[model samples]
Target: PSALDAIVADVREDVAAREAVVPFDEIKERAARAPPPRDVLAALRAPGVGIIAVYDPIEYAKTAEKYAVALVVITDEKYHNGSYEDLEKIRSAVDIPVICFDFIVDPYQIYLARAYQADAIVLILSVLDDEQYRQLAAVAHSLNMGVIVDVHTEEELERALKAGAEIIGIVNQDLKTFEVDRNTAERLGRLARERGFTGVLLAIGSMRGLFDAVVIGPDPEKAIRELV
Candidate 1:
């Protein structure tokens, strides 16, 4: 089957498994504390958050002209079909911040990012060891453009919190098969909250400070209409 087929298969199985093992509503009910994000924060704050994907340079540039956004995440060409030069171009074009959204593993890459005029770099959990994770975050923070830490699981979340990095909760993907499962974003987000049960939570309230970015990919305009 195709890659997307594997994804559909797993989510179907995940639904069945979740229904059978854990009370589905119970989880959803508990998570009800945090509402899904909508286009609301811009009113309360003078300049609210936004995110735009950069693959087609001209298209990304055009999107930048029309909107007020907090950051632009530029995917690498090797992995995300993007380039640092485009990141540089995007930064020069827009007044807002830019992030090098690559699977960054090296300390030098952090320096390269700041040098390229990117306001931030990404530190992916699956890519780094604990020491590198902690060190890179510190290095980025020191540079005044700290890293955006992306964690896919509960354990990665815990590690990120301990390292004192800004966090993004995301769907779990099988690196081997290249498929994504929403279960991690669901169950694991809850687990991360429940881990600090005395301090349990994932909140829209918390997002005011966390700086979340909503991305519509591949076909940005289509996603903007249908998914928005």
Candidate 2:
């Protein structure tokens, strides 16, 4: 199986366990209590290439905010060692937009992100088919959360654009083969623009030149300073 396949399989099991512990209704109530989702799409649409930082510690989010990052991604166990707990913490601690960077396979997870006050969610095109993609994106949109779709190839890009993805991320790493081709973002990003995708086009797993935004890592303070 591919890396994405294995991670998504684990994510399904994890989501099931969480749902068993906390019912969907309870999560929805929590979502209702949390603050409204921020306008991350507006932030990404700004001029120059934006920087989206991912952090494990909540303090890192503060630093990223100080440097004026476009957003902060909260990753969890399946991919990064970070947790939803930290994601929830960062939302309250920082003014910047927060994204739940999980392998979101179910609507339950989307509600969970809302419960934690996430301003946006990530949908990797490789892990979801057309129906799943459309449904998930719709659910997120209904909650007033921005949807950032990650695509590796031209076909995936086409599907994401059709789904009305406001934040299109071009991933350099091939989810199926695990190959890192730094040029993938430049190639696909251009195609997205030519195809009339006027949304926020970002580059993932690559350098910071062509796309409108890039995802940076662990040392947000140092990385953000260096980049900006």
Candidate 3:
């Protein structure tokens, strides 16, 4: 089968496995009651470059609203330690735009983002088809949320662009099951610019310095200066 077919199969399996775990209404209710974070959006669009800090719930809740940091908060733990509700609590405590980062598969995950007062969502193109990507992007857009499509390969970048992605994240970490490439950001940046996608180009994972106005972690201030 092709890559698209493989992604569809994986999504189907994931949906089936997690369907009975969390109810849809519960997530919807949480999202409906959450307030919007206007300040967070403003900060992302702020002048003189930007830095999005990723931190735990307590740290994020305390410092997120103070600075113009675009906070990407991790919802689920890799092991058996926390739950999505923990992410929801973090969302409620902060007035900044929080991005719910998790291994998402079902549509309910999008609704859960809404319930948690998230201003953005991360959609990995490595494991999603064109149709699935479009559907998820549409859902997030309808809710006035920013959808960040993450890509680790040249093919995945093309797929994300074809799926109508406005914000693209070029992850420098190779996650192709076996082999890994460390120069992902440099590679994808050239490709994206060549394709005329000059919107939001976020260089994520293992990125060292900086190239453009996109967010660069692991010493973002130095990266911004170096890029300048």
Candidate 4:
């Protein structure tokens, strides 16, 4: 089976395993107890090129307070043996809108994101079909959470657009394939802009110093300042 077919099978299996839905009111109440990270939003809304980086919440709070940040996106899956519980702890600790970054395949994952206090969620297009993407995007929108669909190739971009993804992230680094292309962001950004997507264009994976708005794995303040 093709990659798309594989993803569809996975999603179907996941859905079949669980039919319970998570309550949104409870999630909202829990989130309300924590204050929004005004500084982080302010930074994201700031004019000129902005950089949003991934960091632990404690460190993120300090950096966010010191520098205007575009936004904070917390990785839900630990890339380096990091626990999901740790990510949950980080989410509870900060009031900022966080994006749960994970390889999502089921509706349960969306509820998990909300429960973790995430204001946004990432959906990778590489692992999804058109139907699955639409379903997941719709679920995310209903929850009032921003959906950032990640795409690498032109075909993936087309699929993402068709799914009505407002915020798009162009990943230049093919992590699964371990490939890097420096021109990835510029190419994808121009394509997105030409297509008249007014939403944010985020450059990810080995795209530092090549794009306007980027999400790097390292400190972004200096890079943002320099780009601006």
Candidate 5:
């Protein structure tokens, strides 16, 4: 198995443990009580180079907000040190959209993210099947939340569009070398627009032109001030 697969396995293990302790009924109840999610689509659609910072602490969220960062992504276990509680904290602290960045394979995680007040969630096309994508997207929409669909290839992009993903994030990292291509977004973003996808288009890594938004930096403050 690849690194991605390994990460997903760990995520599943963690989710399984969490599921054992916290009942689904309680999850649903908490989700039902969560305040209305922020408009992630609107934030990214706004005229400017949108910046998505990886949220660490309140300071990082604050820094992103200080420069009017478009969104903040809260990383998950194995990828980075993040949690649902951090999601709650960041959402409360920032005006921009707060997203849960996890290897989501189950609808349970979607409900849990919404319950924690995540305005949106990141769903990678490579890891999920078409049916899974559609189901997860539906779940997020039902909760009044948005989805940032990450795609690596043209086929994956096609799947994302078919699933009605308003926000498309092009994954630039090459699987073999594990280095970001930087031009992947430009190529796919153009293709998506040509295909009549007028929704928000995001570059998974760093870039300047074409894309509606760009995901950047563990250094929220510096990245926002300089790049954005």
Candidate 6:
């Protein structure tokens, strides 16, 4: 993903005049709800703590399937060079559903997401306000695509729930400071379930950061050894 799904500076280099130019009506308009999400909702509810996860499928597809990962998450358009083309390749190669893990602040992104054949889209509470959150969630749901509303704090969690989120993701990193923590998901996951959020509870983390975490912990080699 771009710096943690970065790609901010280099975001528009490949497209347009490079200034947030959306080709929704410009492109051949991919129909809504054409592609449906896999049973990730069912798999998430199947009983587990972490999702069977992967980023680059070429390197980790076998490992991901081996772990029974309910789905695969592709970091957004620019963040990890994630595009509809990349999404299609992964979906065709693997049997799991794929998510567009991008910063979606506009309704246009939602439409383009479906065009790219994404089964789900990641909507972050930290990125959108109350109105935007509700609007985007409603649009994604209307399209029959799974919505993983990303939240960082308890208040954001409540906001996401109030806006009608069935599948909620707990992001352990602080968006403002870009700091990562292992406790956020656990703490928030408990609170969400208590509030009757028996839906899919997921933890959002980066693939590179996983090793960074292992190396920084008490036992470096042991941590790396166990991870592999």
Runs of candidate 5 with Cα error greater than 4 angstroms are 77-82, 174-180, 206-209, 218-228
Model 6 misplaced regions, further than 4 Å: 1-22, 26-28, 31-33, 76-82, 205-228
What value does the lDDT take at residue 186 in candidate 1?
54
Query: How do the residues 1-228 of candidate 3 rate in per-residue lDDT, one tens digit apiece?
Result: 253344444545544554556566775666666665344445554564566656466675667557635667655422223555666677667666677665455677777667657788878776667778778777777677788788889999988777667677776554334244778778887788789775566766533333333543312112212211
Worst 10 residues of 1 by lDDT: 219-228
Error of 1 at 35 (Å): 37
Clashes of each: 2, 0, 3, 0, 0, 5
The residue-level lDDT of candidate 1 at 25 comes to 50
Error of 5 at 168 (Å): 0.4
Per-residue lDDT for 22-127 in model 2, tens only? Answer: 7778977887677889998888877777788766466677788876555555455332334666677778889888877766778888988888889998888877
Instruction: List ranges where model 2 is wrong by over 4 Å.
Output: 77-82, 206-209, 218-228
Top candidate by lDDT: 2
Distance from true position, residue 78, model 1, in Å?
Answer: 7.4
Tens digit of lDDT per residue, candidate 6, span 32-72? 63566565566555543445564555556555655554445
Ranked by lDDT, top first:
2, 5, 3, 6, 4, 1
TM-score of model 2 vs. true structure: 0.86
Q: What is the C-alpha lDDT of each candidate?
A: 0.48, 0.74, 0.62, 0.58, 0.74, 0.59
Cα displacement (angstroms), candidate 2, residue 117, comes to 0.8
Assess every candidate by TM-score: 0.59, 0.86, 0.73, 0.68, 0.86, 0.72
Q: Which parts of model 1 have CA positions greater than 4 angstroms off?
A: 1-52, 56-59, 71-82, 194-211, 218-228
Q: Candidate 3: misplaced stretches above 4 Å?
A: 1-22, 29-33, 37-42, 77-82, 206-228
Q: Which structure among the candidates has the greatest TM-score?
A: 2
lDDT of 4: 0.58
lDDT of 1: 0.48
**Residue 89, candidate 3: C-alpha displacement in angstroms:** 3.0
| lDDT tens digits by residue: candidate 4, 99-200 | 567667676667656655677777777667788888888877766677777888888888777666667788765533435666767887788778876666
- Candidate 1 C-alpha lDDT tens digits along 1-228: 454344334434434554464354553343333222222123113343445443366566667646644344544323223355566666677655555555454444455456556666656675567987878787666666645566666777778667654444343564324455645555655565555522212211122333334443422212112211
**Order by TM-score, highest first:** 2, 5, 3, 6, 4, 1
